[PDB]
Symmetry: C2
């Protein structure tokens, strides 16, 4: 059941912004690890004396990496005279965020019809304002409200190239890497209490609970009208045999924040071949692969969707498979992206639900918790 | 003239420690960019609840990358019960360093006969203490004094594997990258006033001025007895046509600090081929190459040392060449390693001065300032 209750017009995920200590090194590591190209910059060379921001793209996926310069470079500026290209940026907020949480997502940005209206409707419906709407070069409007922890939901709307003041990156410095990743499928938060977090976000967005279908967590998924913006939220389950990975996150992160980004691939097998080739030479590592048990049990579950060859290809790459009543999900998880056992990445590809493909086809892997436990015990 | 006045027994450069916001991403970027392998770690997986430290090696070159965890993880510890593997580490100092200076070198570490004695003699001769000698597992002694800015000179001495509490990195996570880099040749500081900086450091080390042979700077080089530890120091020259790059450094760095690390290659042509292949796919960029003028003028200067083929190889890779009365220096400079126009890397190879090769053979490139200016003007 989809009541289609969005309180303003939402289009798609627009970008994810990481707050960094050094944007250059994180951006270069991510570019090589995920096969994303450098497409835009805003930094000293573009006249920005406040922050360094570098944009990576793969398909429609946009990752922005931002770090503060010395405040002394901009000490004479005021907000009317700022050289920052993202006017919500604040030196103190960024340093406090990074010192508190380490490397992680500051902003989940969605494109909307009218960012000013989205901001106003959100705050009228309980959203905690973070940065008021500001029009950039009479062309783009950006506004921010609190999502959870120190993560903001950023609204971006375009009258009619990333943001004003960003310059497209020179061809020589823009190598056309591509491992097949094409868009952000969902962005997941960890919170101490699910109930209040859901009530808050659903309260100011009108996002509805996305219909789905004892190991660590409870969760629910909030979704826009066409279910293309998907925001799952997790809470820990305490008192269990193995300590909840949600609680570990909250401890190492100093509270709520973004847990994982799930990146849709147009060919998950090529993406994982390319990413695993680079794991030990600057890229990303992946979670330990499931026992061959798990793949011996895949035939009975998805043998009508994947061939024996396509299944054996899952086993060599460590890919997980789950299934809805509507579609099939192929998924795999990286190890944490930085020093702390906090944020990680999921690579996914969805099979089925053709009409274009409807959002969330095949779910989020709920059935893979039970399947993995059974495999582990029976090994 | 070498008075051999070291006040304690100095061996070689031991390691360089970067203070980071996220050690993982900087270490992975540097590993791929410079061809250094992951060889040791001290982090949560080794019981260290205080800091994450990752060691990269290439030959005898050791780069250590360190970042703080949340202080909450170790809030119950005191120094007698610390889980830190580097007992000089302090959360507040590290966060203050990184917020002030951005990514950069905290420690220039040299191996000595007796770190306790080196510390005592240094402080008795004017060194400002930073961290007193501490014996690690009855096996290694480490001590630190101030060098310039917030950079420390770290003394390490071994009774008889990097440091106690570090674990060697698993073979699967340790890819044997190697682009030919073999050791640290020199480490260079930028200061506002050369005179007082030289008097201070030479005062507590007994290092002597290394004999050498109007564009931005003045400098001098301090050297150990066998001139294998080489510490040049730069100051700005004000009032010039083009603004001094030393002054730009001091402004963007918030004061004195380490300007460049010069890394000796056993085959600079292979190193630069490998590094330039990776510039746009996560590695390091290089300064703009000199005009072909410069290479047209190389024949008259070093045609007795390099063949026409070896010279043309310099031109395609952008390598600079200078010459002493004793030897020849091949050198090239990266663009800044991170967001700020502060620290960068030099790759070098030295030809001549055979006896082993004596330290500093061919100088530091003093003659390349005049040669580059002449080339530029005449283009
Ligand atoms: C992150 C994720 C999802 C996922 O995407 C997701 C959504 O999008 C929204 C709903 C909530 C949710 O979870 C699905 C399945 C997953 C994992 C995962 O992270 N893991 C790794 C793991 C799980 C427990 C652990 C407990 C202790 C120690 C390590 C552990 C590692 C899995 O095994 N499955 C099977
Ligand atoms: C860093 C270095 C060295 C070097 O190693 C070194 C030592 O070890 C100790 C003695 C002091 C010293 O310098 C040698 C030559 C160099 C450079 C360099 O950095 N550069 C790049 C540049 C120079 C001016 C600029 C002025 C304005 C704007 C950009 C500029 C870029 C060079 O051209 N030469 C020719
Ligand atoms: Co997911
Ligand atoms: Co040098």
């Amino acid at each position: 059941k989809n009541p289609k209750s969005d309180k303003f017009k939402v289009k798609r995920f627009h970008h994810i912004e990481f707050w960094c200590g050094d944007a250059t090194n994180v951006a270069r590591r991510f570019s090589w690890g995920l096969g994303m190209r450098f497409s835009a910059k805003s930094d000293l060379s573009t006249g920005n004396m406040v922050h360094a921001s570098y944009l990576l793209t793969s398909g429609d996926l946009r990752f922005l990496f931002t770090a503060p310069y010395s405040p002394s470079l901009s000490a004479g500026e005021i907000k009317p005279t700022t050289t920052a290209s993202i006017p919500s940026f604040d030196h103190g907020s960024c340093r406090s965020f990074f010192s508190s949480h380490g490397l992680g997502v500051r902003a989940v940005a969605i494109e909307v019809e009218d960012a000013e209206s989205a901001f106003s409707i959100s705050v009228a419906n309980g959203a905690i304002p973070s940065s008021p709407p500001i029009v950039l070069n009479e062309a783009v409007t950006i506004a921010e409200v609190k999502l959870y922890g120190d993560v903001v939901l950023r609204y971006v709307s375009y009258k009619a190239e990333f943001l004003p003041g960003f310059e497209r990156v020179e061809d020589a410095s823009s190598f056309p890497l591509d491992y097949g990743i094409r868009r952000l499928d969902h962005a997941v938060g960890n919170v101490p209490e699910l109930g209040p977090a859901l009530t808050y976000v659903a309260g100011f967005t009108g996002f509805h609970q996305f219909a789905e279908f004892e190991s660590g967590l409870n969760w629910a998924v909030l979704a826009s009208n066409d279910e293309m913006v998907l925001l799952p939220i997790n809470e820990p389950v305490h008192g269990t045999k193995r300590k909840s990975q949600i609680q570990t996150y909250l401890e190492h992160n100093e509270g709520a924040g973004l847990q994982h980004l799930a990146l849709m691939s147009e060919d998950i097998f090529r993406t994982l071949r390319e990413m695993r080739k680079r794991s030990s030479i600057g890229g990303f590592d992946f979670m330990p692969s499931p026992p061959p048990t798990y793949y011996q049990n895949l035939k009975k579950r998805v043998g009508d969707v994947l061939s024996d060859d396509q299944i054996k290809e899952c086993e060599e790459l460590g890919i997980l498979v789950d299934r809805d009543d509507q579609g099939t999900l192929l998924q795999i998880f990286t190890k944490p992206l930085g020093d702390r056992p906090t944020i990680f990445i999921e690579i996914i590809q969805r099979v089925g639900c053709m009409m274009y493909q409807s959002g969330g086809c095949g779910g989020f892997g709920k059935g893979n918790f039970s399947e993995l436990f059974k495999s582990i015990e029976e090994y």
